[PDB]
Design a protein around this ligand. Structure first.
Ligand SMILES: CC(=O)N[C@@H]1[C@@H](O[C@@H]2O[C@H](C(=O)O)[C@@H](O[C@@H]3O[C@H](CO)[C@@H](O)[C@H](O[C@@H]4O[C@H](C(=O)O)[C@@H](O)[C@H](O)[C@H]4O)[C@H]3NC(C)=O)[C@H](O)[C@H]2O)[C@H](O)[C@@H](CO)O[C@H]1O
Ligand SMILES: CC(=O)N[C@@H]1[C@@H](O[C@@H]2O[C@H](C(=O)O)[C@@H](O[C@@H]3O[C@H](CO)[C@@H](O)[C@H](O)[C@H]3NC(C)=O)[C@H](O)[C@H]2O)[C@H](O)[C@@H](CO)O[C@H]1O
Ligand SMILES: [Zn+2]
Ligand SMILES: [Zn+2]
Lengths: 608, 618
């Protein structure tokens, strides 16, 4: 945590008040009643958005019974509530886009139905999240509103529906728009301003607590609601400034190198929602209050490009999946806003030759924003080019590649990272995008979290220990040599009796060389070294391992003092078997030798 | 008439001294008292449990804004009402089921229904919402009015609250909390704070209607207050307000007890007056009761006296000739006013069925039906009544003989509720079967209300059992009326002067129409003095079935195994006019066609008289 306070430095309340754009004149989308301009913006999305609306002409708005909320308390079941909720939210979002697309009034009755139904609900908070209310119960209490991820999203959608359709709604019956205004005030505007204690707001934040994606996510949703629904200038400025203060807490908490330590799947709702907030704030101040030119924000964006190896494979340290991806439309808009050419071409590359279409789902802002960027992204040329080395020195992540298709990811860190795995000093090797030395990733400390099942030694036969203090020391990257080095000794407990253990990775054009150099206090038990892999693993001769997997072939050359064995790991958990298939392997390297000082060299290269 | 029977029985001060607090008046066992529920339920137990089980996966139905908008767009009520009623019926059935079983199996669904009901902006029907300030068919979250629907919804919610508060609060006390709020917002407060709801009749003046809405809504509100309002000062004020409101209704109906609309509203008119009086009595420990008032007994006995048999009811005015009733209701009302006739009639109306709990959506009638089943089951079926019933102010006369003839006749005036131009008419039934009929109610058209009402054949005296005097029919209007109407009960003679129901053009001084029923025959007479003989009189009779003319002056009618001869003056030429029935509301009663017998003559004179005789033959 560092006090940058970038937003507060861009303005105080008074300054902000002077640049706030009133009466919703900041809105970038045309008027509902502009068949011509919507037609231009939409292009080929039009027919498709109309077709999606047509499928909802007879959609029955789903009631959420009290028992669905009670179920959270009874059994911890969340989906019984969330499925109908999210179905309603998506229906309302789609209908919005379809009516913007068609403009013939045909989807207005269903929009009005969804909006009216939504006001009758006692709350838009998820059943899993409602226990943060005073009562601590999972059922809505009409006496209190809080804000959560869901309720903020629902609020912003409702605000956008109000914004586009109030005029035709009012013609049918003005009480609908009236009650939407009350609902948004009671469930978003007022709680936001009157309750300092919501955990994601990060006011009263002490060391040891979390600030995560909830902060920029909920603040971006609150901000839209104010910008759309609050027409008093003093009230507006106070809320917007409040949001600036709250987001500063997140910006202060995340490391400047810009790595997202939760991975490429958290990216879209962490960095991605910081971006959204900042786009929203810029738009709302006529671009006068903008952090989109800040280099930390570009680095936070580019993590998504750097961390994406290819064909759906991504770097997956911690409790994260080796298969991931991202929203190419979001990535384009984020890249274009921070002037990352790399991000823009990377978005066109992820399209994998498909035409970009409107984002659906239930996030009104991204849906609407997707409409703006479409023609542009369709014009963008696809490439995934990036430097040979990326070095995140505070997060201690290092990516190194060569022109022959090897990509290595390595890390230092500490055994209390977000969604920790005990993995200080580990690496992952990809060849032509395919994992060859892998990181197992996330189940549904289980074994996937143990250093025993990462690409690491068991020093004196002992694994890494969990804990803040169990950490890398002296992590370095030589960007030009493609050398990563760290001392992992302090990640192990006392009984490991190790003074120093340097693990280093050197990638040249032909090979990856892995070294271990150690000094022990006492040689108690033989070291063991493990590697994780998959596919077709053979042992053609002593000191040699061959790995054949999705068209790739390498050899791992290892010291002849070790005995190599392949351990089969059946994957019954589907969240793992959906990535890797039915089984993966741990190669164990074991020995009878025990010395106080020594070293190992391992060499991985492709072969014919 | 300013009877003010309830205000005479107590004022607010008396009331306050006799109200029973803490719902100690409730006549049902505690939910936890399983032995007492089992004894009360009898064979209803397993029936109600099975009905409950059918609803364990019931999905509570949302009502979309467009369903309410549709009333305005097209007049469609059912789009809104069908899911609404389904919800209410499910909630009512689940209450009964859970009372029957007592194991907590239906609690979750009761909770769900209750919570869903709180989230609705309003419980008012779409057709009724346009009485709000905005005059729209969509709820307005800022404002509540009460209607037929919302009152019943409110009462049902109050009963759910009363029975299941404890197991609800075990789950999550916020549900009961929101229920109390909802009932307060939607029933208690509007009832107290708004003096201008049309059905309360606090602003009533001559010309305006008081109808069934009054006792029906008052009785629902009264329940809510007795269940939910624990401040005795607020309770007394509410109850006394309901007494003043319901007095408007009692003042308005005729003391002779005839429901002039006819039997089809009896269940929700006199029957809801009964419900209101029972609730009031229960809530005051019996201290404020009009259940002993002879007028209330006559109101309830009207349902007996007007029910001929086999689904056939007396149907003057715009009313179906087919009707019926809820035997359980009829029994309870009968018992309460000490009417053996009504209690035996209820048994008769069961048609040999065992009495089971009332289902539907009326929580009070469902619960009350549990209390009465065992005794109604024991009651002997009979439909006994005096040979003559004479309603002297409404001017309805029913006369019967031991050989199966039932004659209904009326005086009155051509501005009665749901009026037909029918002063002086009669209807004859033979072993319950209509033989000289009164066509009754058709499907509403634009012409049904307004001028042109009397261009609809069913409304005209031309198509009732009456003369066309100098070829002229009766005219609509308050002063088009009977005079010198008498009934000799001993001799079974009804007589009336119908001259003044006819316009000037009919140029008639007097026309006495009289009905004499003996042990075998009905004699109909006309005796007339015209001002001038313009045109020949015509006399009409309405009938159905198989109509034949074996000789001059004779007609035979055979219908549904009954057979009669009609003897008419040979001066008349008799023709049979076929009336093919396009309208299902008619054809569902009468079949494909009915007939008008026309009796016509070239005679024309200032005075004369006609005799007709109807007797059973073959
Ligand atoms: C119970 C509780 O309070 N747990 C907190 C924990 O909060 C949890 O954080 C999760 C997170 O990963 O951020 C939440 O997961 C996300 O919830 C969303 C709301 O239902 C859902 O929308 C996410 O998925 C995306 O939504 C998009 C849309 O808005 O259109 C889609 O288009 C998108 O592609 C879709 O995937 C969902 N993420 C998932 C499933 O990975 C969860 O609601 C929440 O409970 C806190 O982070 C931690 C912090 O220490 O404390 C716990 O106690
Ligand atoms: C639309 C409107 O306001 N109409 C007013 C009349 O009220 C109607 O009276 C009917 C009646 O009591 O027969 C009502 O019918 C009943 O409705 C309840 C609730 O849905 C239901 O339980 C019954 O089965 C049903 N009975 C029927 C159909 O016979 C109807 O809801 C109601 O709209 C009012 O009588 C007249 C009086 O002047 O005014 C109209 O404006
Ligand atoms: Zn891992
Ligand atoms: Zn009639």
């Amino acid at each position: 945590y560092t006090e940058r306070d970038m937003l507060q430095k861009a303005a105080d309340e008074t300054t902000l008040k002077n640049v706030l754009v009133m009466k919703q004149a900041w809105v970038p989308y045309p008027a509902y009643t502009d068949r011509a301009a919507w037609d231009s913006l939409m292009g080929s999305n039009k027919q498709r958005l109309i077709a999606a609306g047509e499928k909802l002409l007879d959609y029955k708005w789903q009631l959420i019974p009290a028992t669905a909320y009670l179920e959270y308390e009874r059994t911890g079941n969340r989906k019984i509530m969330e499925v109908p909720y999210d179905a309603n939210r998506q229906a309302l979002n789609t209908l919005m886009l379809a009516e913007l697309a068609e403009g013939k009034g045909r989807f207005i009755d269903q929009l009005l139905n969804g909006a009216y139904m939504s006001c009758e609900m006692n709350s838009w908070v998820l059943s899993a999240h409602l226990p943060r209310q005073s009562s601590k119960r999972s059922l809505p209490d009409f006496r209190e509103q809080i804000i959560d991820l869901g309720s903020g999203g629902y609020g912003a959608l409702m605000a956008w529906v109000h914004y586009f359709f109030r005029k035709p709604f009012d013609k049918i019956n003005p009480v609908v728009s009236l009650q939407m205004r009350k609902a948004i005030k009671e469930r978003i505007l007022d709680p936001y301003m009157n309750d300092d204690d919501m955990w994601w707001m990060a006011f009263n934040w002490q060391p040891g607590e979390i600030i995560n994606n909830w902060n920029p996510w909920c603040n971006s949703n609150a901000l839209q609601c104010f910008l759309l629904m609050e027409n008093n200038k003093d009230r507006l400025a106070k809320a917007v400034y409040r949001s600036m203060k709250s987001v500063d807490k997140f910006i202060n908490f995340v490391k400047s190198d810009g790595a997202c330590e939760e991975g490429t799947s958290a990216w879209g709702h962490a960095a991605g929602k910081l971006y959204d907030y900042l786009q929203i704030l810029s738009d709302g101040t006529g671009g006068k209050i903008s952090l989109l030119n800040e280099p930390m924000i570009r680095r936070m964006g580019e993590y998504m490009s750097r961390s994406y190896v290819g064909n759906g494979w991504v770097v997956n340290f911690a409790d994260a999946s080796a298969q991931g991806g991202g929203d190419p439309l979001l990535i384009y808009r984020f890249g274009k806003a921070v002037n990352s050419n790399e991000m823009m071409h990377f978005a066109a590359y992820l399209l994998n030759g498909r035409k970009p279409y409107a984002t659906m789902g239930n996030d009104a802002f991204r849906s609407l924003q997707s409409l703006l960027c479409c023609n542009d992204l369709a014009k963008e040329t696809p490439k995934h080019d990036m430097p040979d080395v990326t070095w995140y020195p505070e997060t201690e992540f290092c990516y190194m590649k060569n022109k022959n298709g090897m990509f290595v990811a390595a890390k230092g860190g500490f055994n209390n990272e977000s969604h920790n795995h005990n993995d200080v000093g580990t690496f992952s090797l990809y060849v032509n995008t395919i994992p060859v030395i892998l990181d197992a990733g996330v189940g549904t400390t289980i074994w996937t979290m143990q250093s025993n099942y990462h690409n690491l030694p068991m020093i004196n036969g002992i694994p890494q220990k969990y804990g803040q203090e169990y950490k890398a020391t002296n992590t370095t990257c030589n960007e030009k040599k493609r050398v990563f080095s760290t001392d992992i000794a302090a990640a192990y407990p006392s009984e490991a009796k190790v003074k120093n253990w340097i693990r280093s990775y050197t990638l040249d054009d032909r090979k990856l060389t892995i070294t271990d150099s150690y000094t022990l206090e006492e040689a108690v038990a033989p070291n063991q070294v493990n590697f994780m892999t998959w596919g077709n693993v053979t042992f053609p001769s002593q000191g040699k391992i061959q790995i054949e997997v999705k068209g790739q072939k390498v050899e791992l050359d290892y010291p002849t003092l070790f005995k190599a064995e392949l351990e089969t790991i059946q994957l019954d958990d589907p969240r793992l078997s959906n990535v890797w298939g039915k089984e993966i392997y741990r190669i164990t390297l074991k020995t009878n030798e025990k010395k106080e000082t020594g070293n190992y060299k391992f060499v991985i290269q492709q072969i014919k």
